Structures are given as structure tokens and as C-alpha cells.
Design a protein around this ligand. Structure first.
Ligand SMILES: Nc1ncnc2c1ncn2[C@@H]1O[C@H](COP(=O)(O)OP(=O)(O)OP(O)(O)=S)[C@@H](O)[C@H]1O
Lengths: 380, 98, 54, 156, 370
């Protein structure tokens, strides 16, 4: 009856305090513009089937209602009211006012990047051949058409990527986006996974229709396994919507007046299971791949992940790079962050090379050998 | 009988109240249609604005007329989807341990 | 549905659904759940209960 | 009984005995501080929102207190927008500097700039900590008054 | 005897919660609003004070905004207020607080705090410095300039405290918590997994910094159902969408992603690699000493005699869990109300001991081995 008393009568004093407060209780920004905009107009938007000859006589379905023979208001550009061009139409008079850009999609405009991440080429060290060839493919013709056209040669429209998971496909893709100067577009390879039949065809449609209007743009595919591996045939009808989506992506990718000025960077972690229709060049020319960091590129990744932290100057980098032959730059990043966290476990402010020893001899032992657990000799 | 033009008065709309909002204002999804923030009358009760309740809504000005009873019965609907054998103790004889 | 006397809900065959009023010409037993009913054009209020048809 | 006296004479038409008389709360119920959240922000006598704004103060300042600084952070009068960063950064002696740059988002007056500076200073029943902020409670005044503003010596 | 204050404070709380002109410019803005303030949905935004909306059935208009409520509130994919007379955009509507939020966004710090552990005090420190210290006090990342670790994996035997630590991080929290059971990611349609992934983590990314906790994620690789369309060539697509979601692009955000498994062997090596998950965390069954701490905590608020030694319940069984000790406590309570006593004696512990070790740990009918 101590804590009981305490909770009970303290909440009761609270409630009784609240009761007498429940009893003690008892613009010019744009308004004139709005009253001037009651003489504005409703301007319902529509869609055009076709014109007629020698006279406008425009034939329009709204989107839903019916189909009508209408005539334009005299305030139009009498030329640019062409077919399929979504235009605004009066309520009463059914007269047309201004064409506006059409329906893009409900959620496919939402994959343009709209920013620029601060991933820089300097952070992608150890792949200098990949750096320079990616430079040559992407950065040079889209900003400096100096050597290509002036001799009369073409730039390659297509480049594929793969490699070990944790190597820098993400890094290179985000690293272009710092110095893009282009309309970069993100495409997940799982975006084509819809419910309804032939919808991925519409997805490829609106992808390339966003690509065509704005000029000199980038579209990035990612994890193109789900886009489809092959052209399997069996008596059960399996991978079909994915298959037609894949072939429509091939067609509206290239062929019969192809893409124009778009560069597509493709990435996967299983390139061996790809159909030859994607693998044949013209569609994708330079098959640039990624290897493991085998040499002092490892030490350069150490210098990247260490230049943003105040360290002990008495340290080396090649020793741990010897101790991590097969490792990835993601694992390098984990070790560097983990050693920094070991230094933050301490109340110091500068790490040790022994903190790197802690990170190596903790990660590569505890979480590259305890998963999975051995409990058996049999070998040694 | 001269005052039967009360019965000759215009009809009204049955709707769906989600929940009310500020400044004595409410919300109605009507019969096939979307949402319509509608205005309250004087002879009604803001303190009876229930979640998912039909109310009498006027059609001209969309003013609240009256509360409509007998809302939904959703669990009763799923129960009538089931029609389990309704039981009591007097019929599971032969065993009482369980 | 029937709210009470002189007030009911009917769903007309426009698909929509209306808060309406009923007449004292209708004998109140012919509502039972569901009758073919008669309405008005302008005010759209109940006028009459029909015999079994449709 | 003086808390229901607080309830009745809290409604007094003279609105400065409201200020100190309602301001007594952080002295009174400082230990049973779960009742200390009250509806002073739900009231309208803007100095009362100042009073609760005092009443949070400086201890360790849980998420409910900073949640009250969600609304108390956003106000327009320069003495109350001035009044928020003082106890706001007393109650915390990004995270800490996140409401500070939020105040940079609030203004970007001169008072507000001064208030922001005070908040920055704050960022970085013993009677000695009880006196000088009740000495601070008449802040809406000259810098001659603020010549003594630096005499609330309550920290080691 | 505490029922009086309980009922009175509850009724006072409910009544004070139920306790919820001068301005002419505001009334003029009211009169610029219609009396039937209709509701629509946006498609695009055009800078010339008007944009394109859509009706319920699909009529679309160029209608202008009552400009005292801001248009920066307006995003494509929002519900707005429209007029009837010129159908003008009237104002901002509070959003559809969809059942994803009301199910997943748990507002409540659930149960006992870090004093409800057993065999912990390193892994607490790991999850603390990997989630809480990035949340509450990330001034040390100023002091050095290093990324916080990203992902957390809880793994061990069933009944170890995956559930308990998940409730612990959601107890001490200041961010919005989300919870998913890993068996939900297969539905009776083609391509419903990636839609769940995108809308789930979009709602995670839209509100605030947050924590996403998913549990029993291993139930997607080693599970098949007759309630499944497509199959493995849709499970792989679900996995691949979550794969791009976790280690994708565009500055993912302050959303700590914490996972918890029973087994670890049947999982994608592309998903346990860092970049995705930086702090893998072992949960072994820790020690025979903190058995007594779990017996202490789970009997800290029940009257019990002395009458027992926990060493008798240390030298009984070789694998230890809170699922052991809480079952012992509950079965002891069942034997207590079975014999209508309090101050639980030794024989309740002994019969509870034997019946809990049998139900269940034996394996398998004799014999085998023995
Ligand atoms: N050479 C490198 N230098 C610096 N950081 C690197 C390097 N290689 C990998 N990383 C790190 O590893 C991650 C790079 O993204 P990746 O893991 O390579 O994504 P990914 O290449 O698409 O692999 P997937 O998704 O499994 S195909 C980031 O955390 C980088 O910081």
C-alpha cells in the first residue's frame, strides 16, 4: 500500500487537477486573386483521336464519357493540336485551349533520381581500367563530342556489368550520378514484376517515352535476372509475362529506328544465365566486368575508408591487405568501420592498427567462419 | 391533408461517415461516390458522429438531416458466412474430461 | 429499410440509394423486407407498393 | 489544496500573477514529474505557454519534453520564440544541434538571433540552481536587463 | 483495494480526453471554401496556380488553389479538397492513415526494458552502439567521420530472446518502429511481394528516421505452399526486390534494418555480406549462471517461499533458455492453482521441471539412440 497509494492518489490528484481545468474553460495572401479566379475556367482535359482535312473538326473522347466532334477555341495554336495529344476542353462549349504533356504513368515518373548522390570516382579505387573505360563510354560523348564525330565514329550505346557481390557496381552507378550532367533514371529489374498481363510492355513504353523527350539521358537497369534469363519452353506455360516483358524491352531498346541518345548501364550478379538476345552487341557492346581487389587497390580502399577518420599515423595498410586476398570492398568497409567502432568503444579519439587487428580478427573469424559452425576436425 | 407537400419535398442521400474533423465539419462517402466534406445542421449531434454510420444527408446543399440507424453488422455477416453448428453443454455428452 | 413512420430508405434502380419519406396511402404491412415500390420523378419519394412482379 | 487554488486563481484576469503563480509548478511537483505534463499549451494565454516552456527546464529531458518542443519550437512571437531555445538547450546540456539548425530554418528577428545564440550557449532542491532563472523570468526587456542575464550561475 | 483509484483515474482520463466569430478573415476563407467541399486526387502539378486533379470516377480538371494553405504540401499521390462550383483546389486533407501504419507502426514501447535480459551484456552493447548510439548520441561520428554499421542479425535456438530483444529496442525508442513476420511475403497472386517491399519501405522512409524489424526471414527460402502462384520463380523475384531495396541507391536513410532468424545455413550469401548487414550477432545459449537471473526476474513479482535452489534447476538440463524458465514459472503457477496455494513450494517446481523437460525436449521414440 506504498506504491499502490503512490500511483492511485497521484493519478487522482492529476485527474482532480484536470477536472477544474475542464471546468475553468467555461487569409489576405491570395483571396482577391481567388475571387478573380471565379472568372477563371474549369478546363477539363481530354484526348484526341484525329483531326480532319482542310478544317479542324476535332474528334475527341474525354477519357471516359463518350466521343465528340468538337471545335477549338480561337485562342489556340491551330497547328499543335495533333493526335494523341492531351488537351484541355471547355465544359459547355467543348472548345479546346492548350495542349499539355500527356499521362506519363501513375508511378513510373517516380523513378527518375531527382538528386545526385555524392559517390565519386575517387571512392571506387582499384578498378582503373573499369574507371577509364566507363569514362570513355559514358562521360566523353555526352559532354565532349570532340574526337568521336570529328573522325566519324560512333559511341557505344550499351555496357554490361557484373562481378563479385560487393565490388562497386553500386559505386560506379552512383559515381556517374555525381558527374552525370544527364537525366539519370533508376530502374529496378523487379519493377517489371506486376500482376496484370502485358503491363511490363507498358512499363518499357513509358520508360522509353520518358527517355525520348528529354535528350541525352541515362537509364540504369539493376538486377536484370528478374527481367528474365532465357526463353524456356515446357508443357506448362511458366515464365511468360516476364518473357514478353523481356522481349519488348529488347525491341523498344533497339531496332527499327532505335533509341537515340541514351546510355544504359546494366548490372547483374548472374550473367551466365542470360539470353543471347541481350548478350549480342550493338545492344550492349563493352562487356566490362569486375574482379576482386588483388593488390594495393586494397590499400587504396583502406586509404578511402581511412581518410575520413583521424587515425594513428604510425600505421601501414598493405599488411591487412595481405590478410584479405579474396575480400570485397564491402568487407573492407565493414572492417574499417568496425575498427573505428572499436576505437569508439574506447574513450580515445584516434584508433590503432591494433584496432584494425581487432576488426580483422573479429569479423573474418567470427563472421566468416562461425557461419556456418564447424564442430569437427576431419581435415586438419 | 393540405400539409402533405411536406411529402412532396425533395429526396435525400444516405452516406458513410468516416469520422468528423475540426470547426464542426464532417465527412461523407455517399452511395457510389467519393468523399465529401459536408456541413452540419443545428438540430443534430456532433457527439453522435460514429465511425462507419449511415446518416441522412440532404441532397441540395449536402446538409446533415438525421442519423440513420442499423449500420452494418460485419461480424454477423461473417458469422452468416460460417453457419457453424450452434451448441451448448447438453449435447456433447459421452465425455466430460475435455 | 424502414427507419420509422413517414421515413425510409429505398434503393432505386438508378443504382443509387436514397433517404426518402413514405405516404400514408401505403398500408404499412406491405414493406416486409423487400417490395417492388413506386417513386416520384422530381422529389423521388415513395408513392406505392407494387404486387409481386419483376 | 493549493493546486486547486492554482486551478481557480489560475483563471485570474491579471495575467502576470498567472505567470508566476502558474510558474510555481516546476518547483512544486518536480519529483512526481509524470503529472507535470499539463495542457498549458492547450491554453491560449501565451505567457502560459511560456510557463510550461519554463517548466520543462534543464534536467535530462525525455522524448515527451522534446515532443513538447515540437510545438513550442514553432511559434511566432519573438519573446516566446526567444523563450524556447533557452530551456530547450538547458534541457540538453543530428540530435542536440538538430533543433538548433531547425531554428536556423525558423528565422533564416534580431531577438530570435540572440535567442538562437542563447540556445547555442545552452547546448555547450538545491537553491543555487533555483534562483537565477526566476531572476531570468522578466526577459522581455532591455539589454540593460540582459547585462545581468549572465548572473544565473547554476552550473559547475 | 487499488480498484477505486484505478476506476476513478480511468474515468477521469476518458472524460478529460472527451473535453475537446472572432476572426473575420478566417470566415472569409471559410466562405471561399464551398459548403460541399468535395475531395479529389492529384496527377501532376503545373506552376500556373492550377494543376490537374482526378475525380472519383475519372473526370479531370485544371483547377486552382486557395492559397493560404501551401502547395508545397501537395505531392503527386495525395488526397485534396475540391470545390463544386469551379472545382478549385480548396486545401490540404489529412492523409489516409492506411492499415499498414495502424498494423505495423507500433506506437507502444511494449514491455520491460534491458533489465529483462538473460545472459546478455555484450550483445546489448552491440545493438546499443549500432542502433541507439547512431540514434540518440551520434556525436562520435562527428568526432571521427565514420559510417555507422547498418544491419543486425539475431540468430540462435528457438526461444532465445529474439522476440525479447526486438521488444527491448522498441521499448527504449524515439523513432517509428515497424514489425514484419517473414512468413507474410507470399500471397495468392502473381507479383505481390515486390509491391509489399516497395510500399513497406516507402512508408518506412517517408515519416522519419525509423527501425524496420523483420523476424523469421528464413521462412521464404525453405518453404513451399500449395497456396502459391508461380513459385520459386516468384520467390526469387521477391528476394531480388528486397535485395535491391536493402542495398540500393539514393541515400537509403536513417532506417536501421534488424533481422532475426532461427537457422542461418539456408540464407543467401548475397544478403549476409556487409554493405547490407554489418553487425551479425551471435545468440548462443549463454551460461548456466544467468539461468538464475531469469529465475530471479520471472519470479520478481510473484510470492514464493524459499524452499528451492536454482542449482537443482541448473543440474537438470543442458540447453537453457527463457523459454525454459518462463515455462517452469507458468507450470508452477498451474500447479499452484491446481493445489490452491500461494508461496510456491518445491514439489510444484519438481513436477513442473519433469513435465516441462518432457514437453518438450526428448527425441525420438526408443530407441534411438540410446
Ligand atoms: N572498390 C571499392 N572501394 C570502395 N568501396 C567498395 C569497393 N567495392 C565495394 N565497396 C563497398 O561495397 C558496397 C558497394 O556496393 P555493392 O555491394 O558492390 O553493390 P552490388 O555491386 O550491386 O552487389 P550486388 O547488389 O550483390 S550485385 C558499398 O558499401 C561500397 O562502399
Amino acid at each position: 500500500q506504498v506504491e499502490d497509494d503512490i500511483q492511485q492518489l497521484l493519478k487522482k490528484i492529476n485527474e482532480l487537477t484536470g477536472i477544474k481545468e475542464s471546468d475553468t474553460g467555461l487569409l489576405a495572401a491570395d483571396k482577391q486573386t481567388l475571387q478573380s479566379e471565379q472568372p477563371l475556367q474549369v478546363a477539363r482535359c481530354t484526348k484526341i483521336i484525329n483531326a480532319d482535312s482542310e478544317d479542324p473538326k476535332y474528334i475527341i473522347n474525354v477519357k471516359q464519357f463518350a466521343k465528340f466532334v468538337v471545335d477549338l477555341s480561337d485562342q489556340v495554336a491551330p497547328t499543335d493540336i495533333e493526335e494523341g495529344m492531351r488537351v484541355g476542353v471547355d465544359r459547355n462549349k467543348y472548345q479546346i485551349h492548350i495542349p499539355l504533356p500527356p499521362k506519363i504513368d501513375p508511378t513510373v515518373t517516380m523513378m527518375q533520381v531527382e538528386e545526385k548522390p555524392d559517390v565519386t570516382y575517387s571512392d571506387v579505387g582499384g578498378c582503373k581500367e573499369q574507371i577509364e573505360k566507363l569514362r570513355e563510354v559514358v562521360e566523353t560523348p555526352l559532354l565532349h563530342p570532340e574526337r568521336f564525330v570529328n573522325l566519324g565514329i560512333e559511341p557505344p550505346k550499351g555496357v554490361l556489368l557484373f562481378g563479385p557481390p560487393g565490388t562497386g557496381k553500386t559505386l560506379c552507378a552512383r559515381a556517374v550520378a555525381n558527374r552525370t550532367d544527364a537525366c539519370f533514371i533508376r530502374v529496378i529489374g523487379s519493377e517489371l514484376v506486376q500482376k496484370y498481363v502485358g503491363e511490363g510492355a507498358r512499363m518499357v513504353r513509358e520508360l522509353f517515352e520518358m527517355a525520348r523527350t528529354k535528350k541525352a539521358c541515362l537509364i540504369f537497369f539493376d538486377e536484370i535476372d528478374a527481367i528474365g534469363g532465357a526463353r524456356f519452353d515446357d508443357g506448362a506455360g511458366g515464365d511468360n509475362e516476364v518473357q514478353r516483358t523481356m522481349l519488348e524491352l529488347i525491341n523498344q531498346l533497339d531496332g527499327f529506328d532505335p533509341r537515340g541518345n541514351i546510355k544504359v548501364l546494366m548490372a547483374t550478379n548472374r550473367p551466365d544465365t542470360l539470353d543471347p538476345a541481350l548478350m549480342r552487341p550493338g545492344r550492349l557492346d563493352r562487356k566490362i566486368e569486375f574482379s576482386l581487389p588483388d593488390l594495393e587497390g586494397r590499400t587504396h580502399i583502406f586509404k578511402i575508408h581511412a581518410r575520413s577518420m583521424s587515425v594513428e599515423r604510425d600505421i601501414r595498410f598493405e599488411l591487412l591487405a595481405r590478410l584479405c586476398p579474396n575480400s570485397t570492398g564491402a568487407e573492407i568497409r565493414s572492417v574499417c568501420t568496425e575498427a573505428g567502432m572499436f576505437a569508439i568503444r574506447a574513450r580515445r579519439k584516434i584508433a590503432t592498427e591494433k584496432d584494425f587487428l581487432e576488426a580483422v580478427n573479429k569479423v573474418i573469424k567470427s563472421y566468416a567462419k562461425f557461419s556456418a559452425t564447424p564442430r569437427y576436425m576431419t581435415y586438419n | 391533408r393540405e400539409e402533405l407537400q411536406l411529402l412532396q419535398e425533395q429526396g435525400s442521400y444516405v452516406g458513410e461517415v468516416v469520422r468528423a474533423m475540426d470547426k464542426k465539419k464532417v465527412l461523407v462517402k455517399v452511395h457510389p461516390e467519393g468523399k465529401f466534406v459536408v456541413d452540419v445542421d443545428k438540430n443534430i449531434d456532433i457527439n453522435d458522429v460514429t465511425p462507419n454510420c449511415r446518416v441522412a444527408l440532404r441532397n441540395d446543399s449536402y446538409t446533415l438531416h438525421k442519423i440513420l440507424p442499423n449500420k452494418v453488422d460485419p461480424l454477423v455477416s461473417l458469422m452468416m458466412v460460417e453457419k457453424v453448428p450452434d451448441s451448448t453443454y447438453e449435447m456433447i455428452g459421452g465425455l466430460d474430461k475435455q | 429499410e424502414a427507419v420509422d413512420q413517414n421515413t425510409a430508405i429505398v434503393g432505386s434502380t438508378t443504382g443509387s440509394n436514397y433517404y426518402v419519406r413514405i405516404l400514408s396511402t401505403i398500408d404499412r404491412e406491405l414493406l416486409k423486407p423487400n417490395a417492388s415500390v413506386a417513386l416520384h420523378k422530381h422529389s423521388n419519394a415513395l408513392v406505392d407498393v407494387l404486387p409481386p412482379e419483376a | 489544496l493549493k493546486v486547486q487554488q492554482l486551478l481557480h486563481i489560475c483563471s485570474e484576469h491579471f495575467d502576470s500573477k498567472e505567470k508566476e503563480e502558474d510558474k510555481d509548478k516546476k518547483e512544486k511537483k518536480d519529483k512526481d514529474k509524470k503529472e507535470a505534463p499539463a495542457d498549458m499549451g492547450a491554453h491560449q494565454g501565451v505567457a502560459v505557454l511560456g510557463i510550461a516552456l519554463i517548466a520543462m527546464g534543464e534536467e535530462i529531458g525525455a522524448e515527451m519534453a522534446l515532443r513538447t518542443f515540437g510545438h513550442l519550437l514553432r511559434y511566432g512571437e519573438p519573446t516566446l520564440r526567444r523563450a524556447v531555445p533557452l530551456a530547450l538547450a538547458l534541457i540538453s546540456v543530428s540530435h542536440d544541434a538538430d533543433p538548433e539548425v531547425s531554428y536556423n530554418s525558423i528565422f533564416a528577428a534580431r531577438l530570435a538571433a540572440m535567442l538562437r545564440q542563447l540556445a547555442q550557449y545552452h547546448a555547450k532542491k538545491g537553491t543555487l540552481t533555483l534562483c537565477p532563472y526566476h531572476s531570468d523570468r522578466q526577459l522581455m526587456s532591455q539589454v540593460a536587463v540582459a547585462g545581468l542575464l549572465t548572473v544565473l550561475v547554476s552550473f559547475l | 483495494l487499488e480498484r477505486i483509484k484505478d476506476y476513478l483515474l480511468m474515468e477521469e482520463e476518458f472524460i478529460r480526453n472527451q473535453e475537446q466569430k472572432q476572426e473575420e478573415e478566417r470566415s472569409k476563407v471559410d466562405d471561399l471554401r464551398g459548403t460541399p467541399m468535395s475531395v479529389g486526387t492529384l496527377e501532376e502539378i503545373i506552376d500556373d496556380n492550377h494543376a490537374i486533379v482526378s475525380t472519383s470516377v475519372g473526370s479531370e480538371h485544371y483547377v486552382s488553389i486557395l492559397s493560404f494553405v501551401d502547395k508545397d504540401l501537395l505531392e503527386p499521390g495525395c488526397s485534396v479538397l475540391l470545390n463544386h462550383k469551379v472545382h478549385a483546389v480548396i486545401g490540404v486533407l489529412m492523409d489516409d492513415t492506411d492499415p499498414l501504419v495502424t498494423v505495423m507502426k507500433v506506437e507502444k514501447a511494449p514491455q520491460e526494458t534491458y533489465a529483462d535480459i538473460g545472459g546478455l551484456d555484450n550483445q546489448i552493447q552491440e545493438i546499443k552502439e549500432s542502433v541507439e548510439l547512431p540514434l540518440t548520441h551520434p556525436e562520435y561520428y562527428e568526432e571521427m567521420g565514420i559510417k555507422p554499421p547498418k544491419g543486425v542479425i539475431l540468430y540462435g535456438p528457438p526461444g532465445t530472446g529474439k522476440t525479447l530483444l526486438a521488444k527491448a529496442v522498441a521499448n527504449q525508442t524515439s523513432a517509428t518502429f515497424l514489425r514484419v513476420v517473414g512468413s507474410e511475403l507470399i500471397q495468392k497472386y502473381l507479383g505481390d511481394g515486390p509491391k509489399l517491399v516497395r510500399e513497406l519501405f516507402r512508408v518506412a522512409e517517408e515519416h522519419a528516421p525509423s527501425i524496420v524489424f523483420i523476424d523469421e526471414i528464413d521462412a521464404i527460402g525453405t518453404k513451399r505452399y500449395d497456396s502459391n502462384s508461380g513459385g520459386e520463380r516468384e520467390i526469387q523475384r521477391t528476394m531480388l526486390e528486397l535485395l535491391n531495396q536493402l542495398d540500393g541507391f539514393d541515400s537509403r536513410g536513417d532506417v536501421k534494418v534488424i533481422m532475426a532468424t532461427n537457422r542461418i545455413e539456408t540464407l543467401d550469401p548475397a544478403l549476409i555480406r556487409p554493405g547490407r548487414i554489418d553487425r551479425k550477432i551471435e545468440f548462443p545459449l549463454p551460461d548456466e549462471k544467468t539461468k538464475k537471473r531469469i529465475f530471479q526476474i520471472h519470479t520478481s513479482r510473484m510470492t514464493l517461499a524459499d524452499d528451492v535452489t536454482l542449482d537443482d534447476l541448473i543440474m537438470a538440463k543442458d540447453d537453457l533458455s527463457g523459454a525454459d524458465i518462463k515455462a517452469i514459472c507458468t507450470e508452477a503457477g498451474l500447479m499452484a492453482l491446481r493445489e490452491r496455494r500461494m508461496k510456491v513450494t518445491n514439489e510444484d517446481f519438481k513436477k513442473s521441471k519433469e513435465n516441462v523437460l518432457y514437453k518438450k525436449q526428448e527425441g525420438t521414440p526408443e530407441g534411438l539412440y540410446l
